[PDB]
Amino acid sequence: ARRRRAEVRQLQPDLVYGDVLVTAFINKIMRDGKKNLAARIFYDACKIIQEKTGQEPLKVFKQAVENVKPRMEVRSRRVGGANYQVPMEVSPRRQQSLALRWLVQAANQRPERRAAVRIAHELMDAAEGKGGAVKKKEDVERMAEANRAYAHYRW
């Protein structure tokens, strides 16, 4: 977007919990445009969150998403002819996007048989501070702040 500022799309609220973050996670799970299958996967995963954890799955989901959000990342920049890894903060929308994308990607990396079990286990582990998505967050916050010397290339 060069001319305008590219305003953000407003998502419809969730049909169960009434949260737009849940709908965004549904969309990140969605594949080939199958909304019903993605919602089936996510709601069965919510059914798995209970009877495994006494807490309501909405709280677990939100706390896991909060645990996956990275505070700083690192972008490449061409300076003086070379390419440097410059660390800089992250806007909240990009925090949410990276959190949900990493949740889905790390969920599909699990050895669990069907999807709902994968999403449920990944959400639980990310809520209690482990899993592949938290590993991704830690790796990003390592790369960034591992190149602190380039912080004056913030831009």
Add this chain to the structure above:
Amino acid sequence: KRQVASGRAYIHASYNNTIVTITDPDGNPITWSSGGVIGYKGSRKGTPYAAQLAALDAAKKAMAYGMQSVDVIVRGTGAGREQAIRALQASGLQVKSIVDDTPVPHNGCRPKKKFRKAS
């Protein structure tokens, strides 16, 4: 082991490296640091963050001698001068004054070709 408790701080900041020497009020040094004392080896020494690390390391080395209040002296126009200033400013050490004492000649010696088109 001297227990100085008050001294001076010289900051030699250049485009290639920033180096901090903490001395006593008579000028005799106690400890020191630079970008090379920290793990940085090449051009990363002429970095404001490396200057901050060097300033904080020299300050912590001066804490062993039980020093509290300092007098900062700046020499040289280099990247990371003000960063070392702000590093020493809030580092447990009390900064009493900041003085720029960059040695400027009166057109005495001919500079290298890198610094020519002047005198």
Add this chain to the structure above:
Amino acid sequence: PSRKAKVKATLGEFDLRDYRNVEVLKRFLSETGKILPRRRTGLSAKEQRILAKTIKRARILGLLPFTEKLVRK
């Protein structure tokens, strides 16, 4: 633009060629030992040209400094 004050207007009757009067020539030096430009002194070409040599005389005599150290940077 140096709108703070002019050294000539901030002073009265004085000799420009007196190299021994320190308490007046100190006002014409900057925070450093440097000689102030025309915008700060508010003098004319002839006045400035005389002030330069008189300040240099006072410097060689040891009354005025060649250079000082900046504070509070």
Add this chain to the structure above:
RNA sequence: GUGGGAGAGGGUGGUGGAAUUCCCGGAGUAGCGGUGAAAUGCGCAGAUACCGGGAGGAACGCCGAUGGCGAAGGCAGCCACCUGGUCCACCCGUGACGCUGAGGCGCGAAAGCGUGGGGAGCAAACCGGAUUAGAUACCCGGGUAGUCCACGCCCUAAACGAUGCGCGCUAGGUCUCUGGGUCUCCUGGGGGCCGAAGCUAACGCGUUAAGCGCGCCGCCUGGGGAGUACGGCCGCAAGGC
């Protein structure tokens, strides 16, 4: 002529501080330096950074400028001596004594040559490190002649305002240096900008003329060959006319 003025104008001697390098000492530890990134290099024989003391050479920060001086090259710390040019006021003196100027003579940045001295920084050549397809370069670490001084040569240049010198005439406005005066301003000399008439191929010039005139000297006659060859003069040579 008299009375005043401004100036890095020139020559000689002396003198001041900042900085660089080196040495001595103190303190002090593992690197400094350098680059796009590096390496050569220097560092445990103690560097870099810091403090003090000492030696030496070279150039004069701020003032400082679109400024000033000189015929040009060119001239920049300060003081003293010697000395040139120049401008203004008085209307005092001589009474055309004027202008230009082929030759001649002198001056003439830098580089270069000779003899002797000096040599801190910089730095052709050169020794290395990089970069590159190669790098006899740009970049980095060293480094000799030289840069500096005395005396004597060398005569070149984008030696440039790419505009020879002098005089008279032809709207002004503005900035500035420097005198004088009835000191809002006027008047005189110098340095800039914009512009009347006019000029110019155009750009542009325009009381600092490239305008209108006059005097005198220099020079041009398509480009390459060529500032070469021959000859002469000059030079120790390089080479110059």
